[PDB]
Amino acid sequence: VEDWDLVQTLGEGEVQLAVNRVTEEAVAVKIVDMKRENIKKEICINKMLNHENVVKFYGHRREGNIQYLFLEYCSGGELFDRIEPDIGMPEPDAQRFFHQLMAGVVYLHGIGITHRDIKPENLLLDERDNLKISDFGLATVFRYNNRERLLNKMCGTLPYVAPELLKRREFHAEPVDVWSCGIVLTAMLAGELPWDQPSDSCQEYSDWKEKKTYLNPWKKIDSAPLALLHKILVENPSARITIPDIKKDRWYNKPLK
């Protein structure tokens, strides 16, 4: 509909797999029922985007109350399903996924877009296992005519969200996306999330700020990637490593099997 057949639910709004009746071409179709401004910004952001680690936008048609965004099908599914609970994945796989995730985030930030909800559910895999960032539903412009604006809206997903965003009335966009990339890396390497939220109220978060790496997420990780996580998961956003410096990090540049 209309041209394409909607053939299977990919991830409920709902994303359908759409197979072109004629050519056999597959794409994903995202269906959003405007009766059931976020969708306007999402299409608007997607039309700016062009990069091999961001999910391709093909166009949209608005057929009534129903928006249909045609988007690159990623047949590998979600990063999330390559993370084995309590285990993670092999370190070389985590590293390559991390490199590609950084290439995508560098790109977004260079065009002044912040994703604001990076997590394994939103990180999709294509046919050759290349990661693509998806879902610009919560994305927003943080730089325009070369002037940065601070963010005020609290959004994202608690386990991934940086602590300043719970504590500051306004904060810089880029360090929040960096932090969430660090939590994704932890999840890859340990197969578990370090805390429910980065709060005062949260025992495991206090444990980390006190450097108790003999405790569980951290003791599964290993000293080179763990040293990088020490630089990303810094509570103060001004002392947190930036992406140019992530690129200089020793594990980041370690050749892996």
Ligand SMILES: NC1=N/C(=C2/CCNC(=O)c3[nH]ccc32)C(=O)N1
């Ligand atoms: N979170 C999110 N996932 C999206 C898609 C659309 C992009 N391509 C897909 O293959 C897909 N599979 C499962 C979900 C999706 C999407 O657009 N946002």
Ligand SMILES: O=S([O-])[O-]
């Ligand atoms: O424990 S933190 O300061 O990396």
